[PDB]
Amino acid sequence: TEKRINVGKKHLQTLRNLETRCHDSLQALVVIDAGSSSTRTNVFLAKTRSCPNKGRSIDPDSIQLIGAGKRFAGLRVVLEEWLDTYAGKDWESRPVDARLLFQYVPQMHEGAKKLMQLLEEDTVAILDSQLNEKQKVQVKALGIPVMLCSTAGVRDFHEWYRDALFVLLRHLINNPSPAHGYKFFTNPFWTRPITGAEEGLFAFITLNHLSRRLGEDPARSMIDEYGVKQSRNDLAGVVEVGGASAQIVFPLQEGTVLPSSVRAVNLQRERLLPERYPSADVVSVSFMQLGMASSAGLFLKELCSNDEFLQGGICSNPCLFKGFQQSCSAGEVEVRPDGSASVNEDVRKNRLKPLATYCSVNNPEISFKVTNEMQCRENSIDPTKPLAERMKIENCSIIKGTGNFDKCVSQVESILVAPKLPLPANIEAASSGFESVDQVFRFASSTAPMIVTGGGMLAAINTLKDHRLLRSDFSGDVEELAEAAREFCSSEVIIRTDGPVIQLPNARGEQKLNSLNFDLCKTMALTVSLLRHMAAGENQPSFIKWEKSIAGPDGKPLADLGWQVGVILHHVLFTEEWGRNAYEAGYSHNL
Amino acid sequence: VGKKHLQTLRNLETRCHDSLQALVVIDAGSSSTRTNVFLAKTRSCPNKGRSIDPDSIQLIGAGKRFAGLRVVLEEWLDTYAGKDWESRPVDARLLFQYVPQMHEGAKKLMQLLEEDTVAILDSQLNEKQKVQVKALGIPVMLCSTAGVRDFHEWYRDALFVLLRHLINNPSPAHGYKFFTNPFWTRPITGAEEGLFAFITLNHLSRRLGEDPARSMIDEYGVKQSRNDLAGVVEVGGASAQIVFPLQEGTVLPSSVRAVNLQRERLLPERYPSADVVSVSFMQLGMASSAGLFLKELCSNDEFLQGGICSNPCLFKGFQQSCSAGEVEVRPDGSASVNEDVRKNRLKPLATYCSVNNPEISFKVTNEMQCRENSIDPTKPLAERMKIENCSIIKGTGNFDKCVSQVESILVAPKLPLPANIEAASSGFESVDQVFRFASSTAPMIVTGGGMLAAINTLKDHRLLRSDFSGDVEELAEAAREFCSSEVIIRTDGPVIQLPNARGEQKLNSLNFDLCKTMALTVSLLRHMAAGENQPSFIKWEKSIAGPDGKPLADLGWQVGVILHHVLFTEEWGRNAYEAGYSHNL
Amino acid sequence: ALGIPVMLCSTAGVRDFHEWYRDALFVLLRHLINNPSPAHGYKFFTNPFWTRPITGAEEGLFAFITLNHLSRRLGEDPARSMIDEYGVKQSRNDLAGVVEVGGASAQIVFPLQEGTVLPSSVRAVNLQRERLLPERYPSADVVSVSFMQLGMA
Ligand SMILES: Nc1ncnc2c1ncn2[C@@H]1O[C@H](COP(=O)(O)OP(=O)(O)NP(=O)(O)O)[C@@H](O)[C@H]1O
Ligand SMILES: Nc1ncnc2c1ncn2[C@@H]1O[C@H](COP(=O)(O)OP(=O)(O)NP(=O)(O)O)[C@@H](O)[C@H]1O
Ligand SMILES: [Mg+2]
Ligand SMILES: [Mg+2]
Ligand SMILES: [Mg+2]
């Protein structure tokens, strides 16, 4: 044996390789969704690579969700609870001097602290449960960027309260409990309110990243004869209907001549993606009041103060089933086991609360801006009335369902999709050149395929599929959908021993009626309306699909659709800036 | 109150934050291996990452002097190549099977160094400081100099691989997160050893900086330094460095290869530039020159006569056994000479000059360089280091002869002193030639314990002016008088007794041959004075007074190597903070 | 329109030249290159990085670069590179060495097979480390040595 030697010669090259090549390490990334309906964490894992003289960066295709957190209080609740105590009960109906509330900053902090402690703990619970001991070492070492972004739920919030809150939130994120050893941190670029358009663009980025349509390599890019990087497949647009807002985003087919008023976003120019990625001009617009909860409250207020539908105390609703009936208010509906519908009068759980609160005559946004007052009134909110009144549906005792889809559609059309005045709190959408959903496809349009997302939107299509009213291979044909919805929404509601039941026409079967599906027909109408406007556009999307997540290369999805992944990618993709903030500055900055 | 509470918090998240960092430079010099523990102020700013304030760099502890890397390696070779590999052909490919054991031996040394560092950190830092230091990680730069620069075969670079792996696996118990990489921890060339020392000097004396205090952008867009950058001379254990910037636009011979600070990546673009001559000479250090001087002097007939070697660089009345072995001056005034080969001051040179070192075996010119200094590569080690036909060395205390012997032996040798391919490739064979070829009005600072003791001693006895400015002939006078001294044994031990009833001082192991160094200084100043340009002035210094008053750090190459890395902010931020210690996982 | 970079490089013929004369000449050469006749309209220019004496090793390394560029052995794209599992860019084909015998000198240049343990005296050049090629190109440690007196003449 003179191979005791060959082992030495390797021993050295082994060690030489080690100090000359890149090393991979695992990092945690936390996106806290401070959406309208709730505040909740999303915990991501990612593979980082450090190379000699090159620093450290994240492999974007390695980003994967590993836990979606419990749904805690939205930031509105925190803020309005604060105001209740320190501005006095029923500030929604009185002039409140805002300079006075600066002396209660510490207490805002306190209340925020309560929420954040839950979020922190919940994140940590997900990390501890999902990661083996070896993975934990790498994650605790590298620090854990936290991106908390508020969306529609607090986008409309008045005075300076929302931005003050974010200051306090960031300070809270940056002082994590030392006991668990995960080193959370953030900065004012990661943790902030995101605009409607950003909410849209990030969702667009997520979709095209996960579906492997958008990337920088030769797999997903071609540099053309003329030096411009193109995407090999067409980037796909997205439609996301949330709790309080909906986003419509699509890339324009290249060289579309736009009206001067229509303000499209260029991905490179606007620093959404780095220069080395393909570019596109994309339309991204977000509509307040178009979300499930928002639209629900407004739809009732508007329908049931119109004569065609309100007649001597009874409001006939084309979007609710024959046989269904409920108390007349926008309050939260619980479908009880005995088939009755219970409506919660607690103002906070009333689905008009956001819009009613924005429309206060004592909110400077209305007080000084008549155009905003006009927008409120047109949707039957009178800013001069106190809150209770504002949310009250006048002269109405009960709401009875008439189950007429087409009327439902045309009511959704004139109320939500194509209103006379823009739905309130939509200065953003309007400044892009869009007042209503209607106008989006009249002004810009694209052959870009569109993916429709959101629980509601999906439940709408799934339900019709489940009952074999739609093709399994449903491609987006509007008239086919209108047919299925027409039949389905005709259903009669029948109380049985096993509770309330939706019974389909022509002995075609049934399903239980519950708190989530009772008004699902409205969303079917919304979908139909929206597909009709699309189909009327100068360009029409090559196809349309409904999806919740995208199958990963493995087969199983790496993450959910939404803006979460997008916001991560928006930051980590600028490798030099990210390396600086995430690793150089890092958590050690907090000292 | 609330309105402030908010702006307070707003300022916090919008401005830069200061944090303390530890930096460790381990000096793997010829005489020993030792830590130097530095503190520095880091600043992180939103979107700008993190960097070090260079003016905040300060030494906070110089460590204990442990075994040099030569010892580690030769101790390794003794065991695994067999005793007395210095005198036999040793097949180098065979020693690859003993890598693990080299590791083992290195581990012993590094554990001491780590522990010592930690001891310094714990003792110097309060609890609040400790938190910041443990959090940011601790870059370690271990750089070997002349002690191992001459080491043969592949052993030295293998060792460095193992050293880095050891630095990168620190004990978790103390919580300080040491790390390194192949740029920070490595052998440094002679010229680098020079340049860093040059950088240190001009940094600490606030001659070199980027701001308006120390720079002017001229009419033509070039950044100049406001004060003249100063050159340095450092005489270490085994080598000496000479470094000086050239007055701008000096036409050099094509063979003289000067270094440009920007061009050669020594300093970042935003600092003033200069072309600087930096050359390092093996055998010119205190210990190296000591052994070589004896071998050469005492095999010359003028000095060796029937067993007795008359040394002009040793005092009248002093005498010692005839070898290059380490000299202990005993309390009873005798001089004891250690025959242990390892403690013999010819060991490095004698080892390099093996006929079985490929550097000699295949390169006749290197053989010739050995032989010219009375090392015969074909003889076994003991013989090579032996001074032939010599029993005792007696001092004759004649300074001028000492000077002229230092001149021909060390400063202006026929052939270049061995192991100096580096110096030579720069265009310099000998110290002599440096000032013949390039020269500069740049003022010069002389550094090194030896060099300093030389001037201090003459000062202490009032033979030199307190305000000594570098006048050669004044120095030659003082040295002439001093080196004339007679050595007298008294009850209180051996005593150096000055002429003309001029006082006295104890003779000890450090000062017994100090006259040599006085001769070296005189020789060097003479060559300087003969240059086409002459340095505006010359001074001797150990450290530079900080802005406070007290010195921030020592002269040397330590600060320079830190500055060389941290000054490239983007690269440093990347390596020190982004990759950092977390890389080791 | 674009201007015409000029790189004038002296090799072995004047590498050995004594005193300061050769570098003085290069100053004057550059000033001459930078004052071209306006009549022909080609806008020649240079600077002290392009126009200079090149060392033997550079003379070697540039020749090595030429060879592997022209034979399409050396490049940065997926045609001529693979990024390995461990993040290091490799060349797909082996880089080839060169031997050039000129008038006054000969060059011998070759890349080392990766992880060759060299004697401490043997000083190999790393292409990235020594700024010969940019970071995005594959790296190699290459031996490049030039011998005066070995040329034909
Ligand atoms: N299967 C379903 N059927 C009907 N409604 C649903 C279903 N799933 C969720 N919803 C409703 O749709 C909303 C879910 O959207 P979500 O994106 O969680 O809101 P959000 O992000 O908090 N608001 P935003 O600020 O617009 O992002 C909730 O208000 C639910 O009541
Ligand atoms: N006051 C003094 N008087 C005389 N000799 C001294 C004095 N101080 C130190 N020395 C000697 O000078 C040397 C000190 O230089 P030092 O810089 O510690 O060596 P080193 O850095 O290990 N070698 P190098 O590789 O050249 O940097 C030692 O060999 C001492 O023996
Ligand atoms: Mg949302
Ligand atoms: Mg030293
Ligand atoms: Mg040629």
Do A445 and A533 fall within a single domain? yes
**DSSP conformation class of A386:** -
Q: Give the separation between CA B189 and CA B509, rounded to whole angstroms.
A: 31
What is the dihedral angle through the alpha carbons of B521, B522, B526, B528, rounded to the nearest 10 degrees? 20
Instruction: Locate B514 and state its tokens.
Output: 């100090």
Q: In this structure, which ligand is nearest to the CA of C62?
A: 5
Q: Give the separation between CA A52 and CA B181, rounded to whole angstroms.
A: 9
Q: Which residues share a beta bridge with B281?
A: B240
C136: contact with A, CB 8 A cutoff? no
Do A256 and A338 fall within a single domain? yes
Q: Residue B414: CB partners within 8 Å, gap ≥ 6?
A: B372
Cβ pair C153, C104 in contact under 8 A: yes
- Give the Cβ contact number of residue A486 at 10 Å: 20
CB burial of B102-129 (b: ≥16 within 10 Å; e: otherwise) equals bbebbeebbeebbebbbbbbeeebeeee
What is the Cα gyration radius of chain A? 26
- Ligand 4 (ion): residues with CB under 5 Å are B 29, 236
Residue of chain C whose alpha carbon sits nearest to that of A53:
C135
CA-based angle B112:B114:B115, to the nearest 5? 65
| Separation of first and last alpha carbons in chain B | 47
Residues of A annotated catalytic, as ranges:
199
C28: contact with B, CB 8 A cutoff? no
CB burial of B316-338 (b: ≥16 within 10 Å; e: otherwise) equals bbbbbbbbbbbbebeeebebebe
Taking only residues 38 to 67 of chain A, the set having a beta carbon closer than 8 angstroms to any beta carbon of chain B reads 50, 52-56
Which amino acid is it at A138?
Q
Cα of C11 from ligand 5 centre, angstroms: 7
Q: In this structure, which ligand is nearest to the CA of A193?
A: 1
CA distances from residue A277 to A201, A202, A221, A364, A421 in whole angstroms, order as listed: 15, 15, 8, 42, 39
Strand order in the sheet with B390-395: B304-305, B307-311, B390-395, B319-321
Strand order in the sheet with A245-251: A265-266, A281-288, A245-251, A237-241, A450-453, A544-546
Residues of C annotated catalytic, as ranges:
59
Taking only residues 112 to 131 of chain C, the set having a beta carbon closer than 8 angstroms to any beta carbon of chain B reads 117-121
Q: Give the separation between CA B204 and CA B55, rounded to whole angstroms.
A: 8
Q: Which residue matches tokens 């007429």? A: A404
Which amino acid is it at B128?
K
Q: How was this structure determined?
A: X-ray
Q: Give the separation between CA A75 and CA A109, rounded to whole angstroms.
A: 12
Q: How many CA atoms lie within 13 A of B20 on its CB side?
A: 17
C19: contact with B, CB 8 A cutoff? yes
Q: Give the separation between CA A179 and CA A185, rounded to whole angstroms.
A: 15
Do A432 and A538 fall within a single domain? yes
Cβ pair B439, B531 in contact under 8 A: yes
Query: Helix/strand/coil (H, E, C) string of B5-51?
Result: HHHHHHHHHHCCEEEEEEEEEEEECCCCEEEEEEEEEEEEECCCEEE
Do B294 and B420 fall within a single domain? yes
Q: Mind telling me how many Å the CA of B145 is from chain C's nearest CA?
A: 14
Q: Mind telling me how many Å the CA of B45 is from chain C's nearest CA?
A: 28
What is the CA B23 to chain-centroid distance, rounded? 19
Q: Whose CA is nearest to atom 21 of ligand 2?
A: B29
What sign results for the dihedral spanned by CA atoms A409, A411, A416, A418? positive
Residue C114 with chain A: CB contacts under 8 Å: 13
Which amino acid is it at A220?
R
Cα of B174 from ligand 2 centre, angstroms: 32
Closest CB from A103, A584, A591 relative to B573:
A584
Contact: B48, A579; criterion CB under 8 Å: no
Do A153 and A210 fall within a single domain? no
Q: Give the separation between CA B114 and CA B37, rounded to whole angstroms.
A: 11
CA distances from residue B86 to B31, B78, B90, B381 in whole angstroms, order as listed: 20, 9, 9, 6
Q: How many residues does chain B have?
A: 585
Instruction: Locate A456 and state its tokens.
Output: 């509601």
Q: Give the separation between CA C20 and CA B104, rounded to whole angstroms.
A: 53
Q: Residue A110: CB partners within 8 Å, gap ≥ 6?
A: none
DSSP strand pairing (C98-101 vs C105-111): antiparallel
From A295, A318, A294, select the one nearest A306 (Cα to Cα). A318
Instruction: Locate A70 and state its tokens.
Output: 């419990």
Cβ pair B527, B328 in contact under 8 A: no
Q: Whose CA is nearest to atom 30 of ligand 1?
A: A243
C134: contact with A, CB 8 A cutoff? no
Cα of A452 from ligand 3 centre, angstroms: 14
Q: Give the separation between CA B461 and CA A370, rounded to whole angstroms.
A: 97
Do A335 and A189 fall within a single domain? no
Cβ pair B346, B385 in contact under 8 A: yes
Question: Residue B8: exposed, middle, or buried by beta-carbon count in 10 A (0-12, 13-18, 19+)?
Answer: exposed
Cβ pair A78, A165 in contact under 8 A: yes
Range of the domain at A138: 1-194+561-591
Q: What is the resolution of this structure in A?
A: 2.8
Q: How many residues does chain A have?
A: 591
Contact: B98, A577; criterion CB under 8 Å: no
Question: Residue A97: exposed, middle, or buried by beta-carbon count in 10 A (0-12, 13-18, 19+)?
Answer: exposed
Residue B251 with chain C: CB contacts under 8 Å: 20, 23-24
Cβ pair C145, C136 in contact under 8 A: no
**DSSP conformation class of A72:** B
3-state helix, strand, coil in chain A (%, to 5): 40, 20, 40
DSSP 3-state of C99: strand
Do A544 and A580 fall within a single domain? no
Cα of B32 from ligand 2 centre, angstroms: 10
Q: In this structure, which ligand is nearest to the CA of A75?
A: 1
Cβ pair A417, A437 in contact under 8 A: yes
Do A214 and A145 fall within a single domain? no
DSSP 3-state of A383: coil
What is the Cα gyration radius of chain C? 18
Q: Give the separation between CA B441 and CA B173, rounded to whole angstroms.
A: 53
Do A349 and A461 fall within a single domain? yes
Instruction: Locate A504 and state its tokens.
Output: 């389909």
Q: Give the separation between CA A106 and CA B393, rounded to whole angstroms.
A: 85
Do A534 and A587 fall within a single domain? no
From B233, B194, B205, B176, select the one nearest B39 (Cα to Cα). B176
B263: contact with A, CB 8 A cutoff? no
CA distances from residue C13 to C25, C146, C148 in whole angstroms, order as listed: 14, 13, 9
Q: Residue A204: CB partners within 8 Å, gap ≥ 6?
A: A235, A237, A238, A249, A250, A251, A282, A284, A566
Which amino acid is it at A583?
Y
Do A517 and A371 fall within a single domain? yes
Q: Give the separation between CA B432 and CA B279, rounded to whole angstroms.
A: 12
Residue of chain C whose alpha carbon sits nearest to that of B152:
C120
Closest CB from C18, C24, C120 relative to B251:
C24
Residue B94 with chain A: CB contacts under 8 Å: 5
Which residues form the pocket of ligand 2, taking CB atoms under 6 Å from any ligand atom?
B 29-32, 145-147, 236-239, 285-287, 449-450, 453, 510
What is the CA A284 to chain-centroid distance, rounded? 13
From C142, C131, C72, C141, select the one nearest C107 (Cα to Cα). C142
CA distances from residue B392 to A323, B59, B515, B546 in whole angstroms, order as listed: 125, 44, 19, 48
Do A489 and A584 fall within a single domain? no
- Give the Cβ contact number of residue A386 at 10 Å: 16
Q: Give the separation between CA B487 and CA B317, rounded to whole angstroms.
A: 5
Q: Residue A384: CB partners within 8 Å, gap ≥ 6?
A: A361
Test site for ligand 1: of A33, A516, A519, A520, most ligand atoms within 8 A of the Cβ = A516
Cβ pair A43, A65 in contact under 8 A: yes
CATH code of residue B508: 3.30.420.540
DSSP 3-state of A332: coil
Q: Give the separation between CA A79 and CA A193, rounded to whole angstroms.
A: 15
Q: Give the separation between CA B456 and CA A369, rounded to whole angstroms.
A: 86
Domain count of the fold of chain A:
2
CA distances from residue B13 to A109, A415, A581, A582, B6 in whole angstroms, order as listed: 16, 44, 13, 15, 11
CATH code of residue A97: 3.30.420.530
Q: In this structure, which ligand is nearest to the CA of B189?
A: 2
Listed in order, strand segments (DSSP E) in A364-440 are 396-401
A98: contact with C, CB 8 A cutoff? no
Candidates C54, C120, C130, partner chain B, best to mutate (most B CBs within 10 A): C120
Contact: B157, C53; criterion CB under 8 Å: no
Q: How many CA atoms lie within 13 A of B400 on its CB side?
A: 3
Q: Mind telling me how many Å the CA of B584 is from chain A's nearest CA?
A: 9
- Give the Cβ contact number of residue B459 at 10 Å: 15
Q: How many CA atoms lie within 13 A of B502 on its CB side?
A: 18
What is the dihedral angle through the alpha carbons of B259, B264, B270, B276, rounded to the nearest 10 degrees? -10
Q: Give the separation between CA B387 and CA B410, rounded to whole angstroms.
A: 18
CB burial of A120-143 (b: ≥16 within 10 Å; e: otherwise) equals bebbbbbbeeebeeeebbbbbbbb
Q: Give the separation between CA B444 and CA B442, rounded to whole angstroms.
A: 6
Q: Which residue matches tokens 């849209």? A: A200
